[PDB]
């Protein structure tokens, strides 16, 4: 009804917020006030990967820190050897409107998806010597935004129909469905323990989901526009988001509130990707103004600029050993930075 | 590269070069096709336009792809009517199509919206056309405007005058003037007349000449691309 319901809930919103104001003793900017800066971060382009013929929409690193996969909207998934710039596999897609791709932690499978509302799983270790479509997961009524492997037989996807799904690859059926967002979900990130994951949606909100039970644990607000990217802190106790309001934010799971804001008066374009370095001291973000910005995650200071792309930067990645960074743009090039 | 590589490294480089060759061949083949984006609003007649070429010439589904061939030219048409999500999150995926086909039903001027009883269907199609034409991703993309159901419009114009819509219309209330007036209001929404064109056809012609029209409207567009590609502009 309209009485004792949808109004008492507004009281609860006044309680949680109050509980969020009694835990804010100090701020992150004051705790890290008397610590040394990181200086100026200068990175050079070591490799340039050519061979795509349209805009690159997604990329993902392998767990060996040498092989990577990229997806272009010309119907191609390309697997690159980054040390020698050799092409290992070129997979033609049935639908060219791809918007996400993933690499299995074992290295035996890749995943793809896009405007066809289907997640395709490709096997890379066949006895026939070719890459063949292993599975096609269907059931989403909106476009596929992101997908991440949990193991060889589990995957989590986010869709534009305001939902997330945990699948069983061997059976092809949805195992768990996560609902509660108002707008389209645009990104997800798996925790290092795999037991939790965060998602950011077009309703300017992020949510934390427990995989093994399927219920929402916490909701985080504070942005003013759509959240386009999300990433976990290395220890799995915090995460970072990038929005369309030209701002990145850092949220803490245990503190249940926002910690730091990364924004500049010069920057007015949206943010497409975010990433952390191995220690978590640096935060790397990709922007629509063709540049990548490296922020000091503890002092909210812009430490560096990566500028080598003629169009907007659409995807970012940092290897597991923390050696190099990979950037992919709306031109047809991927760049490795050291 | 050179003599510092091993035998297996040389074989891997050879495989990479073969992959590059195949990629270039695929890109060259794909550059010769004509990609069209099909748009409309409600009962505009998109199914009738799609049925103009039923030959292949070669959960909820998101995008429907249709292939056909006319005069040794290959067309791929993309229908995105199924997509019920936020359009601004994926419209930029279609930046670079050859043209946008936009279907509008002429007879949808007396009827009003089902949910919004006090909203006109023609007005809704006009708002959609205004949003698409002046979009930031379609600055130099041409639009082929299809106006369907002229046979029903020429009969509905008798019982009901063209005053329920267009309150400032002063005309003879015949088909030959009302249709030309509607085309003028649809073409007046273009604010990029120095970079894009609108091609209008009354596609209640039951024959196949409709695709013929598209062919012509495509050829001109391609010419205007080459003039910019070759530096003339």
């Amino acid at each position, epitope marked *: 009804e309209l009485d004792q319901l949808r109004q008492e809930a507004e009281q609860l919103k006044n309680q949680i917020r109050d509980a969020r104001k009694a835990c804010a003793d100090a701020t992150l900017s004051q705790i890290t006030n008397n610590i040394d800066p990181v200086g100026r971060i200068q990175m050079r382009t070591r490799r340039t990967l050519r061979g795509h013929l349209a805009k690159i929409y997604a990329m993902h690193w392998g767990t060996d820190s040498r092989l990577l996969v990229s997806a272009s909207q010309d119907g191609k998934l390309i697997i690159w050897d980054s040390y020698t710039t050799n092409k290992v596999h070129a997979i033609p897609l049935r639908s060219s409107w791809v918007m996400t791709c993933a690499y299995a932690p074992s290295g035996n499978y890749v995943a793809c998806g896009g405007l066809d509302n289907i997640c395709s799983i490709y096997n890379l270790k066949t006895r026939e*010597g*070719n890459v063949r479509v292993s599975r096609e997961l269907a059931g989403h009524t909106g476009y596929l935004s992101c997908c991440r492997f949990l193991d060889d037989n589990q995957i989590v996807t986010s869709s534009g129909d305001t939902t997330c799904a945990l699948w069983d690859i061997e059976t092809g059926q949805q195992t768990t469905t996560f609902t509660g967002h108002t707008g389209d979900v645009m990104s997800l990130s798996l925790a290092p323990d795999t037991r939790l994951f965060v998602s950011g949606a077009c309703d300017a909100s992020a949510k934390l989901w427990d995989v093994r039970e399927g219920m929402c644990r916490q909701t985080f607000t504070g942005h003013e526009s759509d959240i386009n990217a999300i990433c976990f802190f290395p220890n799995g106790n915090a995460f970072a988001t990038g929005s369309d309001d030209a701002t990145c934010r850092l949220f803490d799971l245990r503190a249940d509130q926002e910690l730091m804001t990364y924004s500049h008066d010069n920057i007015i374009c949206g943010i497409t990707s975010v990433s952390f370095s191995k220690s978590g001291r640096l935060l790397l973000a990709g922007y629509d103004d063709f540049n990548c910005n490296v922020w000091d995650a503890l002092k909210a200071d812009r430490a560096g600029v990566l500028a080598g792309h003629d169009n907007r930067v659409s995807c970012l990645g940092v290897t597991d050993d923390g050696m190099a960074v990979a950037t992919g743009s709306w031109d047809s090039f991927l760049k490795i930075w050291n | 590269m050179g003599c*510092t590589l*091993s*035998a*297996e490294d*040389k074989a891997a480089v*050879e495989r990479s070069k073969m992959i590059d060759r195949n990629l270039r061949e695929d890109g060259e083949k794909a550059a010769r096709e004509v990609k069209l984006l099909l748009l409309g609003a409600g009962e505009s007649g998109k199914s009738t336009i799609v049925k103009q070429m039923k030959i292949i010439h070669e959960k909820t589904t998101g995008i429907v792809e249709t292939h056909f061939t006319f005069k040794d030219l290959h067309f791929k048409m993309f229908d995105v009517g199924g997509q019920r999500s936020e359009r601004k999150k994926w419209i930029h995926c279609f930046e670079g199509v050859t043209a946008i086909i936009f279907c509008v039903a002429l007879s949808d001027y007396d009827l009003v919206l089902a949910e919004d009883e006090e909203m006109n269907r023609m007005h809704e199609s006009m708002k959609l056309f205004d949003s698409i034409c002046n979009n930031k991703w379609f600055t130099d993309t041409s639009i082929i405007l299809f106006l369907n159901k002229k046979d029903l419009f020429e009969e509905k114009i008798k019982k009901s005058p063209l005053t329920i819509c267009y309150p400032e219309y002063a005309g003879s209330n015949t088909y030959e003037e009302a249709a030309a007036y509607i085309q003028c209001q649809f073409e007046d929404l273009n604010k990029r007349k120095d970079t894009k064109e609108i091609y209008t056809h009354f596609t209640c012609a039951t024959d196949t000449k409709n695709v013929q029209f598209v062919f012509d409207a495509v050829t001109d567009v391609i010419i205007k691309n080459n003039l910019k590609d070759c530096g003339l502009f």
Partner: single-chain antibody
Amino acid sequence: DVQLVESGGGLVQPGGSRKLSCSASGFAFSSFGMHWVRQAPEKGLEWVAYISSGSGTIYYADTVKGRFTISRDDPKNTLFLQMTSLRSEDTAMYYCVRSIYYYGSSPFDFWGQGTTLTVSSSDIVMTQATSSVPVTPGESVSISCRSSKSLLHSNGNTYLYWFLQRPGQSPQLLIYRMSNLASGVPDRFSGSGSGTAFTLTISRLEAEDVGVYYCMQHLEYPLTFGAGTKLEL
């Protein structure tokens, strides 16, 4: 089911010509490089010829160069070896081998059944130094291979391969690049070594694992095998 079937062998007179055919079924024949290998009666293995994927690279052994020609027909999935001026040193049993080359691949992973040819009538040296050992089931044994040149390249790879040939069958891959275990091979097998000396451990023995073990190098394209270590009883 991967299958390679070889045909064209028979009794030939000293001097003459003969063509051997290798038909492949069950895999992507065009993506694999192909090798012709031979085994003399009661002798070891000997690499003969190699043709790349796409026919862009061809190699011959020094003992058959100028008289042997290797070719492939990819639409028909066939490999041909044309041999002319046959001597009494060419009577052997010939095997067709497939091998693919990219990062992390497993070359030399499948061999054919072989065809018998009978005539009426600096290269790296690989030493095994042991021709026969007695083994019993349940025990553990070791096989040693020695090279005349360091097989470790300046990229981290040591190119050494191990093959097992059971009585009456064709060789099969066990270990590639001195450490990796081939698909469908029990975990009992292991390999380890320095740049010059290498060791293969069988762990527990069974009714299987009885036959001849060979070590091969893949650093310089003139490919050489060991003498072969025999495991009896």
